Write a protein that binds this ligand. Structure first.
Ligand SMILES: [Ca+2]
Ligand SMILES: [Ca+2]
Ligand SMILES: [Ca+2]
Lengths: 412, 480, 51
DNA sequence: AGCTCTAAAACGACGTCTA
DNA sequence: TAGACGTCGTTTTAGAGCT
RNA sequence: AUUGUACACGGCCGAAU
DNA sequence: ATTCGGCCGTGTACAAT
């Protein structure tokens, strides 16, 4: 004759599921006994890193449904109505009380503070289906309920499991060989007109100490008089790139910069006065947009603004570093200004300061991702034409043990 | 690239109380070194308008100042007042007879001078005489506050001379700094001096910028200004507000920061140093000294013997307090350590028997950075090990503050240890991050630079106007 | 039971600071404040001073 | 299609009829 | 006097209801 | 100069041609 | 002249998304 209806089993299952979610987050959950009234359990916070309980408790009331839409449910949000006595009991307590709704059909949990009532209504809670999901990602927000924002000096450690951040370094895959040789000239400044005189011209070479260093074969192009043809040799790149000599390092960096300049000449253009790779404008007073993958999104590299007229081009002070016998390219986002798209805009301090001041972390991350995508794509041939000499690969994404509680800072 | 995030270093206040924020730590436990006597006699120099104006601000801070931004209560806390939660456990009183008034005729005398350099030097002589009178008498102030009037600020700082810039007609370069010159010329006086503009103690008063004449200067909220100003006043009174909480098992270490500054002519380059170590007890000693050498030049680095004498002085100064040479000597420099420098440091240590040393070049001009996903930068204390070079994020998102107190994406420090280094980069970054929280010139605890590096540059400003061979006080209270 | 219940009474206020203190007397001024419009119109009438 | 009471289950003792 | 039957208290979800 | 950051501008230095 | 490295100094904008 004894019966345990599916309603009680479903409620116990919902409580167990919420406890499991809380334990997955990293907190502690205590279930109240028979004498519970208006509070299904207590959540105690715990530091994910140190494992030390934080001693801050919050009550939890769990309501479970097998299926069925909530009040005014849609794709983006829904609504819930509280009992008046339950709300009064929650308000006369001394700890924050949250309510979690658990739907078994789709296995979803949505949490909200019982005091976060809809404007003008005491007992209505408007659950946002995008931000009110009960899961580890919400942990920080839950912790935000424990502390009183009014009293000073109270805080909470970051309660998220971790985060992922990228670096601006791009790993370079150097060619297995390097063309080293002698030369009539000790400095390339005098040699450049000699190369201009000959047939084929390309600026992917370095003259440092009467020695000629290049990635491409000097014989196959117009760089003939620049180099003694008899002494031309191709040697393993480990004898030029990965060594300890200072001038070898300087020549390697200069050659890498010139190779990147030539390889990315389709989209970029170099400014020697500031060593700045800025997106060249196609046509005077004609604009350009760039599409990159991060999910494909367009960043608008070149912008004019009306008035007297100034053109902002995205730019980067691409530099080179050698760490752990590997070569990395460092991307430093910046902006360049031109009067008509080609002639540099004199007096750009005001525009530069205005553009930099309003730039936050997200914008800089977007810019560096766009530059990384551009330099990665420029290293692909996809054949007729010589394959690009330098190929850049994104570094493995950096893992951080702690995360910024950004989700709890939407209204500081 | 293995990344690490350091938890905020622990600070020590009051009767051994610990907190991670100087403002909240002072409110709960009080200053680390309690003051004998409940009154801090503050002397004020300025016009009768500013002297009376600053006097009520000190009383106003005693009553209590509300928070300037209730949304972020940790970043902009209210000044408690004179109750149980008094940050410094003492009253900032201006005792009777401890005020000196700059007459309107005296101000007109300084303003009337045409050349900016001559006006500054004449003003320094005028204020120095008033400072001498203040300390000669029975006033006996603990710290002297110079409440500069608005007309004086325009001439001394903004170089306003009746509309036309006669000094700019001379086309001189590197106009004299009134503050740096004034501090140098009053080093012989026994009382530290503090310069205060009317903007801090009066929201109504506005001071225009030097170049942007239309625009006024923008200042923090009044509560934040009181927190930073009174903490400096308390420190200049002679008591350390807070100290890094020391680990029970750590090597007795002294941090030495090395910096450089120009020689008032824009060409030569001297070296200024700062030494930081514990006081064998609850205290923390921060000294600022100049190299005794005379090897003039433009190189932003030390030589062989000159670097050796710098360490010898630092060891001797440490030995004067602990009566034993330090176990570890951490040297922080603003420029890359060279072979001549490192062998100079090693020679001094060999003559003294120091076991462990670390030679770290703190670099801010590094293009390397990391970016998380979101509208906020990485957490403060984030560290990336870039093959023996430490990428330390001394500035960034602060969970305690609930935001990031900056203007753009923060620029990280790059710690480049020399080959002749003992500690691993992970421990060096942890020490450098801790040193940023012990800069007493402000109560906000997220400073980009470590204290020895920060203190070295501050010492260079004052010592730029001090003639070589003149013995000056090494106490950092005279420079901050 | 009564002693235990007194622990949760929270005698301490929720971190509120009260600026004012003991006060003797108050008064008001005959002075009154004026708000002004954000626009004025000027011209040069063919008359001298409105006579 | 929302609320709101209303059913349906369980446990916890405790009067109240109902003999 | 015993002894179910009942009322009272709670949770628990879900339905027929008035709207 | 309550406080520091970011940005802009300027000066200068070290190694080899 | 270049190419690679770096450093110190004086101003404005802003109080932090
Ligand atoms: Ca329950
Ligand atoms: Ca429940
Ligand atoms: Ca100061």
């Amino acid at each position: 004759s004894k019966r345990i209806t599916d309603s009680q089993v479903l409620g116990e299952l919902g409580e167990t599921a919420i406890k499991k979610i809380v334990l997955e987050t990293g907190f502690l959950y205590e279930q109240r006994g028979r004498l519970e009234a208006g509070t299904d359990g207590i959540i105690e916070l715990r530091d994910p890193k140190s494992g030390a309980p934080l001693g801050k408790l919050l009550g939890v009331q769990v309501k479970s449904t097998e299926s069925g839409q909530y009040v005014r449910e849609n794709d983006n949000s829904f609504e819930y109505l509280l009992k008046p006595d339950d709300l009064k009991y929650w308000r006369t307590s001394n700890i924050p009380v949250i309510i979690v709704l658990w739907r078994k059909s789709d296995e979803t949990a949505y949490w909200k503070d019982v005091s976060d009532c809809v404007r003008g209504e005491e007992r209505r809670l408007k659950f946002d289906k995008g931000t009110d999901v009960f899961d580890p990602r919400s942990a920080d927000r839950i912790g935000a309920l424990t502390i009183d924002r009014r009293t000073p000096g109270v805080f909470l450690p970051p309660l998220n499991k971790g985060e992922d951040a990228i670096i601006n370094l791009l790993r370079i895959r150097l060619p297995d060989e390097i063309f080293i040789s002698t030369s009539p000239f000790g400095s390339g400044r005098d040699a450049v007109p000699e190369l201009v005189k000959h047939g084929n011209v390309r600026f992917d070479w370095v003259i440092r100490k009467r020695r000629f260093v290049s990635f491409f074969d000097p014989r196959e192009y117009g760089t003939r008089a620049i180099v003694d043809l008899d002494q031309v040799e191709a040697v393993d790149t480990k004898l030029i790139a990965f060594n300890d000599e200072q001038d070898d390092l300087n020549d390697t960096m200069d050659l890498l910069r010139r190779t990147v300049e030539r390889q990315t000449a389709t989209q970029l253009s170099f400014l020697r006065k500031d060593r700045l790779f800025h997106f060249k404008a196609v046509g005077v007073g004609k604009s350009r947009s760039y599409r990159y993958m991060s999910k494909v999104v367009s960043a608008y590299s070149s912008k004019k603004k009306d008035g007297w007229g100034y053109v902002r081009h995205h730019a980067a002070r691409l530099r080179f570093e050698r760490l752990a016998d590997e070569w990395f390219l460092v991307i430093d986002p910046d902006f360049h200004f031109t009067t008509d798209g080609f002639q540099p805009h004199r007096y750009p301090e005001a525009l530069l300061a205005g553009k930099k001041r309003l730039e936050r972390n997200a914008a800089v991350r977007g810019q560096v991702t766009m530059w990384q995508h551009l330099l990665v794509e420029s290293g692909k041939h996809e054949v007729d034409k010589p394959a690009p000499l330098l190929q850049f690969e994104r570094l493995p994404v950096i893992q951080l043990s702690q995360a910024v509680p950004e989700s709890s800072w939407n209204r500081t | 690239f293995k990344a690490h995030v350091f938890d905020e270093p622990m600070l020590e206040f009051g009767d051994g109380g610990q907190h991670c924020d100087p403002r909240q730590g002072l409110r709960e436990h009080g200053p680390l070194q309690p003051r004998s006597g409940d009154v801090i006699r503050v002397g004020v120099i300025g016009t009768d308008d500013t002297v009376a104006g600053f006097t009520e601000f000190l009383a106003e801070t005693g009553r209590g100042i509300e928070s300037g931004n209730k949304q972020l209560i940790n970043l902009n806390p209210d000044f408690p007042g004179l109750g149980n939660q008094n940050p410094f456990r003492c009253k900032f009183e201006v005792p009777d007879g401890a005020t000196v008034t700059i007459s309107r005729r005296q101000v007109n005398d300084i303003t009337g001078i045409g050349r900016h350099d001559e006006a500054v030097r004449h003003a320094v002589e005028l204020i120095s005489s008033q400072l001498s009178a203040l300390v000669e008498g029975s006033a006996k102030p603990d710290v002297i506050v110079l409440a500069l009037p608005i007309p004086l600020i325009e001439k001394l700082v903004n170089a306003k001379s009746e509309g036309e810039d006669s000094d700019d007609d001379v086309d001189g370069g590197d106009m004299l700094n009134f503050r740096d010159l004034l501090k140098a010329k009053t080093l012989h006086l026994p009382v530290p001096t503090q310069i205060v503009w009317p903007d801090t103690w009066d929201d109504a008063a506005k001071i225009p910028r030097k170049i942007k004449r239309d625009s006024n200067r923008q200042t923090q909220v009044k509560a934040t200004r009181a927190w930073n100003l009174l903490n400096a006043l308390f420190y200049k009174a002679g008591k350390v507000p807070w100290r890094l909480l020391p680990d029970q098992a750590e090597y007795r270490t002294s941090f030495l920061g090395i910096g450089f500054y120009r020689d008032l002519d824009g060409q030569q380059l001297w070296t200024s140093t700062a030494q930081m170590f514990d006081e064998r007890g609850r205290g923390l000693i921060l000294r600022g000294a100049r190299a005794q050498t005379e090897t003039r030049g433009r190189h932003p680095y030390l030589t062989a013997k000159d670097a050796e004498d710098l360490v010898v002085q630092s060891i001797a100064a440490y030995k004067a307090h602990h009566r034993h040479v330090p176990a570890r000597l951490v040297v922080l420099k603003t420029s890359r350590f060279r072979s001549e420098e490192a062998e100079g440091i090693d020679a001094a240590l060999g003559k003294s028997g120091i076991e462990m040393s670390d030679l770290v070049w703190v670099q801010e001009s590094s293009p390397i950075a990391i970016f998380r996903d979101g509208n906020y930068p990485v957490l403060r204390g984030t560290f990336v090990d870039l093959d023996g070079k430490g990428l330390l994020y001394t500035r960034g998102s602060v969970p305690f503050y609930g935001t990031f107190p900056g203007l753009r994406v923060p620029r990280p420090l790059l710690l480049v240890p020399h080959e002749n280094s003992d500690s691993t980069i992970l421990t060096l970054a942890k020490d450098v991050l801790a040193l940023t929280k012990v800069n007493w010139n402000t109560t906000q605890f997220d400073q980009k630079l470590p204290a020895p590096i920060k203190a070295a540059r501050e010492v260079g400003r004052i010592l730029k106007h001090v003639e070589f061979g003149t013995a000056v006080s090494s106490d950092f209270r005279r420079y901050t």
